[PDB]
DNA sequence: AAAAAAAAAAAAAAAAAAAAAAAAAA
DNA sequence: TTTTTTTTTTTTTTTTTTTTTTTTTT
């Protein structure tokens, strides 16, 4: 399990950031590291929490994201173009070239 | 435990305002204990009314508050003068500038004590909105908090951006301050800048600056000691008329300017320019319009501008 | 089943009000329903004054006094009206509708909140100090019996998770053990905001009072912290659900981390007796539920031409036509000052701006103009800054020395309510895509002068400390005001000797403007006369060719253009750069000067509303550069 | 009437270690 | 001037134990 805060660049200047929880299953563990900036494709879900209903006072639900795809964007400004999860990886014809 | 003025109050206010010399009477009333120093009392009486305030769409808001700085030899009676003007004014705060937080005069986002929550607490400049704020020990105020006053005396607003809160408040107050020099005397030979230990812009932006001097004079020393001992010896001053008159003049009255003020003001400024910055003329206008609010009127004339220029040139004399 | 009679009268009266008002015969509310049908909206707006004239307030006062009990009938009547006049708004791709009231006659403060208005329709005002996330609230629940597998739907919930009691089939006997069908259930947006009293309503000595306002539906995120907002809605009361028997063991009978007040231990009157409570005591507190919120404190040409009206469109195109327009614009800037036309021209060029370009290799070319204005005191240098901050959008004002920890770039501060390191905003950061007006630029701290070495050119701030590492964004133009060293300008020393800035920082300023006053008998008379023509007539003293709004519209229209360079313009540019480099002799002139000349040429071209650049523009930019060196 | 299960009851806080600022001086 | 000096600021609770006394449930 990991926690994603909003990136400082995306956050409007002077406002508090928001955070969410992400569940990483097998084959996706230890890919992301604490401190990096990441892009996650996943499914947005809801669940019932007793404490959340007790504190707020209304039947509100908790949300969490089950991660499907992970792409690293730490230091990358070429995200404007390019296709794929890793732009530093090659195919067979590219190695032959 | 421990407003809504009646018509009779209006009538008595009118008949008192019909006095031949209203200037000197409330000159002596504000500080009964203070002997001599009539000129600083004149300036404070003019400050307590303030020139008219205006904010037109194109040019924007123009200030109508008078700022006064008292400084000089260390054992005069400036602190008692400030504590006198504290009570007369309706809404004001008397806090020294010796220490406290760097934003202690403005908003400071603080954690609530009773509940683990967030509270926005305003400072002393915001809490003196629409009145006169008295600062004591101006020379001990820290280099980092000084800049705060700079935005207060320039734009009359304070902005806070902390803990996810970005907002602006309103200061719109008047600054009366008292300071002390370095050493036991203010030697006239050296100029003002070295003694007072204050940045040139901060001293410059004050509308009136008064120097209080103490020289060993037999007549003055005897006269001072005489009335001091007479006060200690056990044997024309209104009590609350000033507060009601101040409120009436501040809440209902708005003077205007006529060409009679034009003719005197332009030539007076030019004659002063025969090192008077453009700040000087906007200082004369404020003082003249504040004098016009006194001796209750609805328009300025020659007497008000003459008194204003006399005051601002007697200030230059020191 | 027992039914109500007054509720039926209110329901039919609301239907009549919706169907019949028509006062502008326009059918304003039917026009609104048609607009919702075409735009697919989910909320209606009803004005109180409009309702304040039908039935002489008999319906309005009935709705106001008992809004809580009359809302179900109002929605029921709205459903019939929608069905009769627009069936398409009866189903989604049913839309849970909302009714928004506004324009109430009187407003209340937070300290007028008493328990005798609970359930009534009110309007309040306050300053927002905290907002939360947009959480989903359970509106219409759906369950399935564990044994029968029968489906129950539309189980209303008030303040806690409520499951059904009797199975749909009386043959089944089941009191519990249901399974929520989270997919079939309907949800809604939910937000909690904290507000406090205004600065004027606070007494001389007071600890500010607070309140909890609930925003729901389409009203989320419309209130931002630090702003002053007027809310309107219904005053409700919220019980403590923890002692109402919440299903899970997670509540654990009021687990606490802090100590409750001993003063109100037994003093807070709690009611007992109810079977659900048991031997417990139920407690209440007052909160507010809001239905309407108000606040009381694109370079694409085709889309731009759509918004403006026909009269505005014709006026703008007639404005563009005249060839004297440029000479007029420099006169419209800051009409409340005397002289300094060059400063006005520079400010206008700064506001128009230059084009931003990106190379295939990924390096960004700057398109922001920085101006520095210097001179001896009392030269009206601080009036220009106020005019810009009042007239330019997304602009901020600041001084050299700053009291804040994040003085001008950024600071790293721990979370007040979280377990992470956050980043505060300096004046440079709070001005992204805007102008930052710096005053008293001389007395800056060296750790800030070195910090601005990145913001002026790369337009970024990059920090790396123990807590956080980030590359922030500061794409801001800078207008700076500075005083000469020593107090007064010397008319034989250069800009360098009189100023204190270093060559790195000095070379990053596009324009330098030295403004000097002179003490002669005649000009002083004109200046005094001009400054004193004000204070008698606040509006007729100054007369510019264009008002503030016309200039503000023209700037936005002109910024849509993006000029290009012609064939002869490039040759003239390289020739002028070579001549300037020759005249310098490399100490003050670099490539940055050529880039700044390109930027100034593009801005001057944007001024004339021309998409092509003529060598006359480069000549003007060259003259402007030469005038400041 | 007699079993099996399920929570309340917490409370507490000084004393030390590490890191970033905002004032002092050879 | 770049060195040393200096205040100071959150850092804290997620855990416990077997009785003793309550409600359900054959
Ligand atoms: N002109 C004066 N009239 C009356 N009392 C005076 C005068 N000058 C000095 N004093 C006496 O000297 C003292 C001045 O103290 P104060 O001015 O409050 O201290 P500070 O110098 O810190 O402002 C007062 O107690 C006052 O009685
Ligand atoms: N047209 C003008 N020409 C010269 N001075 C003016 C003009 N209009 C106003 N002023 C004066 O200039 C002042 C603006 O402050 P300014 O001199 O810019 O402060 P600083 O020089 O410290 O930045 C105002 O107080 C006003 O009195
Ligand atoms: Zn069943």
Q: Could you please report the per-residue DSSP string of chain B?
A: ------HHHHHHHHHHHT-TTHHHHHHHHS-SS--S-HHHHHHHHHHHH----EEETTTEEE-----EEEEESTTSSHHHHHHHHHHHSSS--EEESSSS-TTTTS-EEEE-SSSSSEEEE--TTGGGTTSEEEEE-GGGS-HHHHHHHHHHTTTSEEEEEETTEEEEEE---EEEEE---SSS---TTS-HHHHHT--HHHHHT-SEEEEE-----HHHHHHHHHHHHHHHS-----SSHHHHHHHHHHHT------HHHHHHHHHHHHHHT----HHHHHHHHHHHHHHHHTTT-SS--HHHHHHHHHHHHHHHH-
Return all residues near C580 (Cβ < 8 A) that are at least 6 apart. Answer: C589, C593, C622, C625, C626
Query: Closest nt to B111 (CA→C1')?
Result: E10
Q: What are the two backbone dihedrals, phi and then psi, of residue C101, each rounded to the nearest 5 degrees? A: -100, 150
Write down how long chain C is: 629
**Is A8 part of the contact surface with chain B (CB cutoff 8 Å)?**
no
In a domain, C315, yes or no: yes
The DSSP symbol for A31 reads: S
Q: Could you list the residue range(s) of the whole structural domain that residue A29 is in?
A: 1-74
List residues, by chain if needed, whose CB lies under 5 Å from ion ligand 3: C 145, 148, 167, 172, 174
Distance from CA of C136 to the nearest CA of A (A): 6
* C199, C204, C377 member nearest B277 (Cβ): C377
Nearest-angstrom CA–CA distance, B120 and B158? 13
Q: Answer yes or no: do C536 and B257 touch at CB < 8 A.
A: yes
Q: Which helix (H) or strand (E) holds C79?
A: helix C67-85
Pocket test for ligand 1, best of B74, B76, B139 (most atoms within 8 A of CB): B76
- Domain finish residue from C268, C297, C326: C297
**Is A12 part of the contact surface with chain B (CB cutoff 8 Å)?**
no
The DSSP secondary structure of C341-365, one letter per residue, reads: HHHHHHHHHHHH----EE-TTSPEE
In a domain, C302, yes or no: no
Distance from CA of B87 to the nearest CA of A (A): 41
Give the 3-state secondary structure of residue C518: coil
Nearest-angstrom CA–CA distance, C102 and C100? 7
C515 near C381, Cβ under 8 Å?
yes
Instruction: Provide the token pair at B275.
Output: 């090192």
Return all residues near C114 (Cβ < 8 A) that are at least 6 apart. Answer: none
> Does C147 lie in the same domain as C125?
no
Question: How many CA atoms are closer than 13 Å to the CA of C511, on its beta-carbon side?
Answer: 28
B42 near B23, Cβ under 8 Å?
yes
Using CB distances shorter than 6 Å, the residues near ligand 2 are: B 278-279, 282; C 337-338, 377-383, 481, 527, 530-531
B161: closest CA among C404, C623, C183? C404
In a domain, C250, yes or no: no
> Does C204 lie in the same domain as C170?
no
> Does C100 lie in the same domain as C153?
no
Distance from CA of A6 to the nearest CA of B (A): 14
Task: Tell how far the Cα of B307 is from the centroid of ligand 1, in angstroms.
Answer: 29
Nearest-angstrom CA–CA distance, A58 and B315? 68
Q: Is the CB of C419 under 7 A from strand E?
A: yes
Q: Answer yes or no: do A9 and C182 touch at CB < 8 A.
A: no
Q: Answer yes or no: do B111 and C397 touch at CB < 8 A.
A: no
Nearest-angstrom CA–CA distance, B236 and B246? 18
A30 near A57, Cβ under 8 Å?
no
Experimental technique: cryo-EM
The DSSP secondary structure of B88-105, one letter per residue, reads: HSSS--EEESSSS-TTTT
- Name the residue of chain A whose CA is nearest to B166's CA: A14
Nearest-angstrom CA–CA distance, C342 and B66? 33
* C190, C242, C430 member nearest A58 (Cβ): C190
Using CB distances shorter than 6 Å, the residues near ligand 1 are: B 33-35, 74-80
Protein residue closest to E9, using CA and C1': C414
C209 near C112, Cβ under 8 Å?
no
B85 near B132, Cβ under 8 Å?
yes
Residue with tokens 């400390």: C465
In a domain, C581, yes or no: yes
Give the 3-state secondary structure of residue C2: coil
Q: Is the CB of C245 under 7 A from strand E?
A: no
- The domain tally of chain C equals 4
C368 near C476, Cβ under 8 Å?
yes
B68: closest CA among B142, B115, B160, B134? B134
Return all residues near B76 (Cβ < 8 A) that are at least 6 apart. Answer: B212, B214
Pocket test for ligand 1, best of B30, B73, B77 (most atoms within 8 A of CB): B77
> Ligand nearest C169 Cα, by number?
3
Bridge partners of B176? B68, B134
Query: Closest nt to C415 (CA→C1')?
Result: E10
List strand E contacts in C 255-284 (CB < 7 A): 255, 257, 278-279
Nearest-angstrom CA–CA distance, C105 and C122? 10
Task: Tell how far the Cα of C31 is from the centroid of ligand 2, in angstroms.
Answer: 54
**Is B8 part of the contact surface with chain C (CB cutoff 8 Å)?**
no
> Does C177 lie in the same domain as C100?
no
> Does C462 lie in the same domain as C334?
yes
A59 near C157, Cβ under 8 Å?
yes
Q: Could you list the residue range(s) of the whole structural domain that residue C499 is in?
A: 310-629
CATH no. for residue C422? Answer: 3.40.50.300
> Does C124 lie in the same domain as C27?
no
> Does C613 lie in the same domain as C475?
yes
Q: Looking at strand D, which nucleotides approach a protein CB closer than 7 A?
A: 6-9, 12, 19-23
C164 near C175, Cβ under 8 Å?
no
Q: What are the two backbone dihedrals, phi and then psi, of residue A85, each rounded to the nearest 5 degrees? A: -90, -25
Task: Tell how far the Cα of C340 is from the centroid of ligand 2, in angstroms.
Answer: 12
CATH no. for residue C65? Answer: 3.30.1640.10
A75: closest CA among A34, A38, A28, A30? A38
Cβ count within 10 A of residue C285: 11
Give the 3-state secondary structure of residue C511: strand
Nearest-angstrom CA–CA distance, C590 and C454? 18
CA distances from B84 to B46, C123, C575 (A): 15, 43, 73
């Amino acid at each position: 399990r990991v926690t994603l805060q909003e990136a400082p660049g995306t956050v409007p200047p002077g406002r508090l950031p928001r955070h969410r929880e992400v569940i990483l299953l097998a084959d996706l563990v230890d890919v992301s590291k604490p401190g990096e900036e990441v892009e996650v494709t996943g499914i947005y879900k809801n669940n019932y929490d007793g404490n959340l209903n007790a504190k707020n006072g209304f039947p509100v639900f908790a949300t969490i994201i089950e991660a499907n795809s992970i792409k690293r964007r730490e230091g990358n400004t070429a995200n404007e173009g390019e296709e794929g999860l890793d732009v530093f990886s090659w195919t067979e014809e590219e190695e032959r070239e | 435990k421990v407003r809504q003025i009646t018509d009779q109050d209006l009538a008595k206010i009118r008949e008192v305002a019909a006095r031949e010399d209203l200037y000197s009477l409330l000159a002596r009333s504000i500080a009964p204990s203070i002997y001599e120093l009539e000129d600083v009392k004149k300036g404070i009486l003019l400050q307590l009314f303030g020139g008219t305030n205006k904010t037109f769409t194109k040019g924007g808001r123009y200030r109508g508050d008078i700022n006064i700085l008292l400084c000089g030899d260390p054992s005069t009676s400036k602190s008692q003068i400030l504590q006198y003007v504290h009570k007369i004014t309706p809404r004001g705060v008397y806090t020294s500038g010796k220490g406290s937080s760097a934003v202690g005069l403005t908003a400071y986002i603080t954690r609530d004590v009773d509940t683990k929550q967030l509270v926005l607490e305003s400072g002393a400049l915001v809490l003196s909105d629409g009145g006169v704020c008295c600062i004591d020990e101006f020379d001990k105020m820290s280099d980092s908090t000084r800049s705060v006053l700079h935005e207060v005396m320039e734009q009359q607003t304070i902005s806070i951006a902390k803990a996810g809160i970005i907002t602006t408040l309103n200061a719109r107050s008047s600054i009366l301050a008292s300071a002390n020099p370095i050493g036991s005397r203010y030697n006239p030979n050296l100029p003002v800048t070295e003694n007072i230990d204050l940045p040139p812009p901060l001293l410059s932006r004050f509308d009136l600056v008064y120097l209080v001097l103490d020289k060993v004079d037999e007549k003055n020393d005897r006269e001072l000691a005489k009335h001091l001992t007479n006060l200690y010896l056990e044997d024309v001053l209104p009590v609350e008329f000033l507060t009601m008159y101040i409120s009436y003049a501040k809440e209902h009255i708005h003077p205007i300017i006529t060409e009679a003020a034009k003719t005197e003001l332009v030539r007076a400024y030019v004659g002063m320019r025969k090192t008077a910055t453009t700040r000087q003329l906007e200082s004369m206008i404020r003082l003249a319009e504040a004098h016009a609010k006194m001796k209750l009127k609805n328009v300025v004339e020659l007497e008000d501008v003459q008194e204003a220029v006399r005051l601002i040139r007697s200030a230059i004399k020191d | 089943k027992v039914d109500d009679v007054t509720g039926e009268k209110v329901r039919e009266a609301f239907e009549q009000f919706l169907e019949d008002f028509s006062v502008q015969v326009e059918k304003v509310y039917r026009a609104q329903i048609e607009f919702m049908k075409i735009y697919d909206l989910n909320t209606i707006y009803i004005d109180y004054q409009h309702l304040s004239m039908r039935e002489n307030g008999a319906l309005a006062m009935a709705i106001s006094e008992q809004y809580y009990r009359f809302l179900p009938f109002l929605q029921k009547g709205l459903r019939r009206v929608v069905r009769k006049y627009a069936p398409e708004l009866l189903n989604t791709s049913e839309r849970v509708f909302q009714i928004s009231f506004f324009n109430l006659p009187t407003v209340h403060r937070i300290r007028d909140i008493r328990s005798e208005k609970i359930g009534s329709l009110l309007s309040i005002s306050g300053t927002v100090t905290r907002t939360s996330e947009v959480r989903p609230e359970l509106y219409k629940a759906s369950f399935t019996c564990d044994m029968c597998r029968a489906i129950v739907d539309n189980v209303e919930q008030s303040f806690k998770y409520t499951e059904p009691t009797f199975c749909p089939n009386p043959s089944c006997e089941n009191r519990a053990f249901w399974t929520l069908n989270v997919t079939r259930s309907r949800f809604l947006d939910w937000q909690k905001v904290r507000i406090q009293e205004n600065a004027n309503e606070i007494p001389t000595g007071s600890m500010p009072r607070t309140l909890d306002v609930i925003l729901r539906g389409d009203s989320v995120e419309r209130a931002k912290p630090g702003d002053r907002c007027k809310f309107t809605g219904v005053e409700i009361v919220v019980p403590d659900v923890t002692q109402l028997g919440l299903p899970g063991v997670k509540p654990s009978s009021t687990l606490d981390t802090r100590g409750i007040s001993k003063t109100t231990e037994g003093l807070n009157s709690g009611v007992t007796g109810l079977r659900s409570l048991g031997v417990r005591d139920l407690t209440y507190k007052i909160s507010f539920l809001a239905c309407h919120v108000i606040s009381i404190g694109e370079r694409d040409q085709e889309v731009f031409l759509n918004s403006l009206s026909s009269d505005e469109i014709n006026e703008l195109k007639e404005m563009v036509k005249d060839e004297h327009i440029y000479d007029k614009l420099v006169r419209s800037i800051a009409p409340a000052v005397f002289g300094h036309e060059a400063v006005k021209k520079g400010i206008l060029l700064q506001m128009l701006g230059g084009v931003h370009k990106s190379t295939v290799e990924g390096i960004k070319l700057r398109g922001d103009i920085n101006i520095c204005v210097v001179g001896d005191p009392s030269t009206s240098k601080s009036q220009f800054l106020k005019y810009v901050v009042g007239f330019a959008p997304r602009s901020v004002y600041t001084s050299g020395k700053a009291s804040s920890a994040a003085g001008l770039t950024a600071a790293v501060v721990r979370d007040e309510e979280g377990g992470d390191y956050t980043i505060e905003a300096g004046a440079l950061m709070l001005a992204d895509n805007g102008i930052c007006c710096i005053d008293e630029f001389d007395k800056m701290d060296i750790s800030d002068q070195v910090a601005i070495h990145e913001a002026m050119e790369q337009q970024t701030i990059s920090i790396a400390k123990a807590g956080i590492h980030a590359t922030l964004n500061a794409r801001t133009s800078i207008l700076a005001a500075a005083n000469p060293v020593g107090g007064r300008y010397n008319r034989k020393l250069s800009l360098r000797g009189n100023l204190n800035m270093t060559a790195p920082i000095m070379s990053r300023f596009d324009l330098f403007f030295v403004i000097l006053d002179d003490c002669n008998e005649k000009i002083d008379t004109e200046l005094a006369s001009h400054i004193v023509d004000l204070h008698m007539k606040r509006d007729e003293a100054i007369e510019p060719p264009f008002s503030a709004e016309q200039l503000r519209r023209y700037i936005k229209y002109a910024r849509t253009f993006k000029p290009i360079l012609t064939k002869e313009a490039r040759s003239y540019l390289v020739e002028k750069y070579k001549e300037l480099r020759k005249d310098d002799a490399s100490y003050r002139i670099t490539v940055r000067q050529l880039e700044s000349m390109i930027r100034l040429s593009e801005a001057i071209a944007r001024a004339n509303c021309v998409d092509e650049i003529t060598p006359s523009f480069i000549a003007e930019a060259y003259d402007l550069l030469r005038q400041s060196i």
